[PDB]
Amino acid sequence: NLEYKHPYLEDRDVKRVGYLVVSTDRGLCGGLNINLFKKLLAEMKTWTDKGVQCDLA
Amino acid sequence: RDEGRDVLLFVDNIYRYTLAGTEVSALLGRMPSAVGYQPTLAEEMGVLQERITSTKTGSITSVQAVYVPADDLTDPSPATTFAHLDATVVLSRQIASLGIYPAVDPLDSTSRQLDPLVVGQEHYDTARGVQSILQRYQELKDIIAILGMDELSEEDKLVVARARKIQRFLSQPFFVAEVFTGSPGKYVSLKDTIRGFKGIMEGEYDHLPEQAFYMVGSIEEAVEKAKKL
């Protein structure tokens, strides 16, 4: 059934991208959050340089 | 002075003078003051210190190396000597232990003429701006040591980073100091000193690493050093 209508199966031209980010509700846990954010930011940059926007949940 | 107008007076260790008066005070047969000093410390200092001044007939510019015993700025010699100075720059061992070798503590060091009406507003605001963020950093220093950097707000994070740039842009190699250190000397314009610090504080030169600022002349040297590393 997938081919006829992918809900989400097929690839397509990237122009925007979304990110569900999982941070913690509480601090005092080292760089658990910072290292995540720092990775996300760095990867978002490679996207924005290609002229694509990034939405965040 | 009482003839020609402009003279320079350099004195090594006014302390050595007071200290001499202490080795004697016992034999001169007077009771000991606080910490074993002479009871006449107040005057022995003042007499000599009051002599150096700008007369109507001629002025005297004078720098002098006032020693502080056992690092105690509360020790009487330094404590009383303070009042007799127009500008009072103080060198701390903590700042030397780092590598900053104009080892001036920019916080405990001040002048009576860091006045806006005197040194212009740009110099003043820059001076007190640099003073503030450097002090705000001293406060954060505690929580950092116990709970690490990752606990600061993204704003305070930037405060320490910008401060640590200032903290080592204060440094610069002295010509006279070339002898025992490879680093060739440099001389910075009072004009550039303002341009750089004002600059770093605005957030212009952030991208550069810290070492870019350590031991250099004008800001344009910090830039070029950042290239090499």
Side-chain angles (χ1 to χ4, degrees), chain B residues 1-196:
Chain B
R1 170 190 63 180
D2 299 332
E3 45 171 278
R5 300 200 331 100
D6 304 338
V7 300
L8 268 53
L9 204 219
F10 302 96
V11 192
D12 163 276
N13 283 135
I14 329 299
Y15 174 74
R16 292 285 112 84
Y17 154 92
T18 302
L19 186 277
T22 302
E23 311 183 357
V24 181
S25 176
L27 303 316
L28 287 192
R30 59 259 222 131
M31 293 187 67
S33 192
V35 223
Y37 281 80
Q38 55 278 275
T40 49
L41 222 182
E43 294 194 350
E44 284 196 332
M45 203 72 200
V47 173
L48 176 54
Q49 218 65 72
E50 199 58 81
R51 201 100 68 83
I52 309 177
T53 340
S54 162
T55 302
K56 305 261 47 167
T57 63
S59 61
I60 305 179
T61 353
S62 59
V63 331
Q64 45 186 4
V66 41
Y67 180 102
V68 35
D71 270 333
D72 193 344
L73 283 302
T74 297
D75 190 89
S77 312
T80 74
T81 292
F82 277 142
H84 303 160
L85 279 297
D86 271 7
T88 172
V89 11
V90 42
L91 317 168
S92 75
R93 187 188 293 336
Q94 357 296 344
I95 303 194
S97 80
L98 269 295
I100 287 64
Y101 262 97
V104 188
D105 180 339
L107 286 175
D108 270 76
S109 171
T110 69
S111 169
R112 186 175 286 102
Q113 256 169 341
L114 217 184
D115 189 315
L117 334 178
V118 165
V119 74
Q121 195 65 30
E122 45 284 346
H123 184 135
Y124 180 81
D125 281 328
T126 289
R128 270 194 57 192
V130 163
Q131 197 160 200
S132 162
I133 87 173
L134 230 175
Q135 148 75 33
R136 176 71 223 282
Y137 174 47
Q138 282 300 329
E139 297 181 0
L140 287 174
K141 267 190 176 185
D142 214 81
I143 188 179
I144 298 175
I146 307 281
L147 300 185
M149 276 297 310
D150 294 315
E151 285 298 340
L152 306 185
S153 59
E154 279 308 301
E155 350 290 352
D156 288 338
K157 232 161 160 127
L158 180 71
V159 166
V160 320
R162 221 109 95 181
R164 293 173 57 95
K165 258 73 162 300
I166 274 72
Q167 192 177 62
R168 60 205 59 231
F169 190 43
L170 265 37
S171 61
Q172 90 207 228
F174 293 144
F175 295 88
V176 311
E178 294 175 19
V179 173
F180 59 148
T181 72
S183 204
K186 285 287 181 176
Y187 175 134
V188 182
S189 354
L190 181 41
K191 174 197 174 310
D192 278 22
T193 309
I194 307 281
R195 251 296 297 172

